[PDB]
Amino acid sequence: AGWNAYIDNLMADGTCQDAAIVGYKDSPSVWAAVPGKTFVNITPAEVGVLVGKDRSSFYVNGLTLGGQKCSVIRDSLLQDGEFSMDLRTKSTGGAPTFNVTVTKTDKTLVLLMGKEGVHGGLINKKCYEMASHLRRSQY
Amino acid sequence: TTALVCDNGSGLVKAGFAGDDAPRAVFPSIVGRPRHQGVMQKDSYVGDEAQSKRGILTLKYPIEHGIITNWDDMEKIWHHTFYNELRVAPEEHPTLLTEAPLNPKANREKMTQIMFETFNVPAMYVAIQAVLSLYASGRTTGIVLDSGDGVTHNVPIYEGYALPHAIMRLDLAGRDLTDYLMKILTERGYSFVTTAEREIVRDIKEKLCYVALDFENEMATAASSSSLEKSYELPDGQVITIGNERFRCPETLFQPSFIGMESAGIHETTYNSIMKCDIDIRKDLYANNVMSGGTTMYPGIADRMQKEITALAPSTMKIKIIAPPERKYSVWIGGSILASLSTFQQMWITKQEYDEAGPSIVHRKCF
Amino acid sequence: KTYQSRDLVLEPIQHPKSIELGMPEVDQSVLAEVAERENVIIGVRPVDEKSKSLIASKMYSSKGLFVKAKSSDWGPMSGFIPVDQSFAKASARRDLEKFNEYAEQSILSGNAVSANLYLNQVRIEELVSKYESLTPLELDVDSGMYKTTATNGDQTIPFFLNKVTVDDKELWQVHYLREGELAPFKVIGDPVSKQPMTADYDLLTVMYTYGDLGPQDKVSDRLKELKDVINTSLGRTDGLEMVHHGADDANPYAVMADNFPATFFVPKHFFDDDGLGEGKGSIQTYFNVNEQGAVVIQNPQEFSNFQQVAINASYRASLNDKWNSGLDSPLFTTKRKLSHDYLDARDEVAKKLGL
Ligand SMILES: Nc1ncnc2c1ncn2[C@@H]1O[C@H](COP(=O)(O)OP(=O)(O)OP(=O)(O)O)[C@@H](O)[C@H]1O
Ligand SMILES: C/C1=C/C(=O)O[C@@H]2C[C@@H](CC[C@H](C)/C=C\CC1)O[C@@](O)([C@@H]1CSC(=O)N1)C2
Ligand SMILES: [Mg+2]
């Protein structure tokens, strides 16, 4: 599918290190993602935690995206006009951690992970703008 | 072009320029309007000027418990800050404003709209007060206990991001402590009830109060000797002796039942806040407890928090309380740090972004 | 052993020498105790060395506000402000009309009185023998006074000194030839005590702990209260205060003898082994401190280093206080004097934020 063009668009300005568009209805699957990165390995169990009815068990010790442990910073998944979650990876020692935003549309999750030092607000705005474009195209 | 940093407190406005190590202006957060409200000197007075003319004006606090409640009066405060205190044209400076933890979405949207539409700032950013205090300590992960004049919060923060699900609020802060000290001195036969008497008691509180390491032991010492007594000269020339009131007043932070509140104390809400965070970050929070705000200035408060948190936590947990000497102003100082970094230019909301998205741009960009 | 914090490097003082100060050491000890009790850093401008005995006598008042007439540096009036400004320093002698008008207006406005000048025996001995400012006194028969002349200023003017008893004290009254006739010499005196004004203790700067900074209930009430504590501690008779409320204009003048050597007084924790930090040493290792606790600041560079050490220790000049402290700026700007805790935190945050 021509979904790779959306990944190229998200990765164009050099602020992000990973990006993905994931269908979450029925049997979830990665429609498009940056090859060899983390989001490409997202599982249906991980999608289930992101979109699940329970909005508190992921505060015990976070959640994973492609096996990468993340903490939830803001859960705006059920907030009108946002439908997003902001996360930050969890690593060891002085290893860098990165901001992630997930935005939910009618049929997809748009996921974006920033490079080191890229502010979560920049990633959230970028993810929001792509999700808005997809909603206009009935996705 | 220099960015401006404004910390709008329930009690005091702290304002200045990014890159400076202290605010240039610190003034009371009050607006005074004429008592005569008819039709046939000035529409309003702000801060220092408002208090001087207290006899002819009705004074109000536009921020209650850290949240803006009177928007018309808040615009008067911002106008005064820019034009009278800082002497700058707001349209020439990017402006960093602070907000309380858990500030409603409608309030942060209105603050954004007022900055761009009323003051025409070129860019702006809204930061949570406690996060800026953590930056002023040279950290990006930790848990801040911020207690000012109007509200107290425990705010755990991961890499510069406050964790709202774990924030705890205690609706008890410096003003309630002043009112409690007024009540317990009045119980001795003195009379501290008026607005002017409230200011005398606030001065007694700031000068002589402290946090006891062991409250019951300190009460027993106060009842068996005069070793803890201090004298204070009142404006009329009378001398009042402050004894167990010196430590009973801030003890209310640890025991809110003293003022009839059923809330847990600041040590218990610190534990509760840490426990609402991921298991993986809890050791880092316990080792990085930063105190900020005027109500954390009591001598002995860091040693008391160290003892109380040690008693709650697993015995093997490494606990550290950081209480910087400049903590009355660490929110402002942290804002000056953030707004002076080259990474800030990518964080601010520009007028172009505001024109494209409207006030809800503050949800996306500021957290 | 060496002190280091960012770009501030101070090497321990090798072979510390004693520095001559104008302020009597009895008063230096008082100010050292005030700095400790009030937990403030107090800086005082140098006092002219020759006026020390005048101040130590505790008989005179000190220079108040609104007095623009100049003091004298010659004759028996040395250290005082003569009503006739032809007897003042050279700058007044070359602008007589201007300075005589300042002296007369200070008396007409109630800010001063015209007072007789009495000197003690210590002063006569200093002027004749220690400083050789006056020629040896020669007794006259007709007046019963001793004639002398100055060895600097206008050496042709005779002065006449008379032994008098003023309230159980044996003093010398100064007389001169006013329009050719013997008359009592007049100096500017305080309007309450009526006593001649000597140099005062002019505060250079006051640096407070964070707790004492911020808005005030009432141009500063915090400085007014500290000045009252200082005058109370100095214990002079009511009306003979050495420190005055308020401050005169900044003035477009400089001269090193007017700002250095300054005497700073600091809280006693600065003198401990961990005074400047955990293992950074005591303040007296890097700054010249005398036996009375006076921290002696000799030049603008030392002042800048001292100010940085004080700001690093969370002592700052108030926002509400107005000072003209600086002179010969090595780097006396806002950006150059930022606290090292601020700069270190900014560096740490920049690193953590990916910069
Ligand atoms: N030395 C001190 N000891 C105790 N309390 C103090 C001290 N100094 C200031 N305070 C108190 O701190 C309060 C002001 O602190 P601060 O400026 O942090 O509050 P704020 O930012 O205006 O309020 P908030 O953040 O609650 O909206 C007042 O209640 C004041 O009496
Ligand atoms: C010196 C000072 C301190 C302060 O914290 O002031 C702030 C703002 C102030 C506003 C009213 C007051 C009469 C004006 C100015 C005093 C400002 O109210 C406070 O004093 C209130 C009332 S008593 C108390 O503890 N907080 C706090
Ligand atoms: Mg505050």
Author numbering:
A (entry chain C): 1 to 139
B (entry chain A): 5 to 44, 49 to 375
C (entry chain B): 466 to 683, 727 to 863
Provide passages from the article that reported this PDB entry.
This Vn-ExoY module (shortened by 32 C-terminal residues) shows similar catalytic activity to our original Vn-ExoY412-873 construct and allowed the determination of two additional crystal structures: (i) nucleotide-free Vn-ExoY bound to actin-ATP-LatB and profilin, with a sulphate ion in Vn-ExoY NBP (Vn-ExoY-SO42-:actin-ATP-LatB:profilin), and (ii) Vn-ExoY bound to actin-ATP-LatB with its NBP filled by a non-cyclisable ATP analogue 3’-deoxy-ATP (3’dATP), at 1.7 and 2.1 Å resolution, respectively. The Vn-ExoY-SO42-:actin-ATP-LatB:profilin structure is very similar to the structures of the VnE/VnEDM-PRM-Prof chimera bound to actin-ADP, with the Vn-ExoY switch A similarly disordered. (E) Structure of nucleotide-free Vn-ExoY in complex with actin-ATP-LatB and profilin (Vn-ExoY-SO42-:actin-ATP-LatB:profilin). In our nucleotide-free structures of Vn-ExoY bound to G-actin-ATP/-ADP and profilin, the Vn-ExoY NBP is still only partially stabilised by cofactor binding, showing that cofactor binding is not sufficient to fully stabilise the NBP and catalytic residues of NC toxins, as previously suggested. 42 to 46 of the 53 residues from switch A are still disordered. A SO42- ion is bound to the Vn-ExoY NBP via residues (K528VnE-CA, K535VnE-LID, S536VnE-LID, K554VnE-LID) that coordinate the γ- and β-phosphates of 3’dATP when this ligand is bound. To reach its most favourable binding position, the nucleotide must move ~4 Å (distance between the SO42- ion and 3’dATP γ-phosphate) through the LID closure.
Here, we explore the Vibrio nigripulchritudo Multifunctional-Autoprocessing Repeats-in-ToXin (MARTX) ExoY effector domain (Vn-ExoY) as a model for ExoY-type members that interact with monomeric (G-actin) instead of filamentous (F-actin) actin. While Pa-ExoY requires actin filaments (F-actin) for maximal activation, Vn-ExoY is selectively activated by G-actin in vitro. The catalytic domain of NC toxins can be divided into subdomains CA and CB, with the catalytic site located in a groove at their interface.
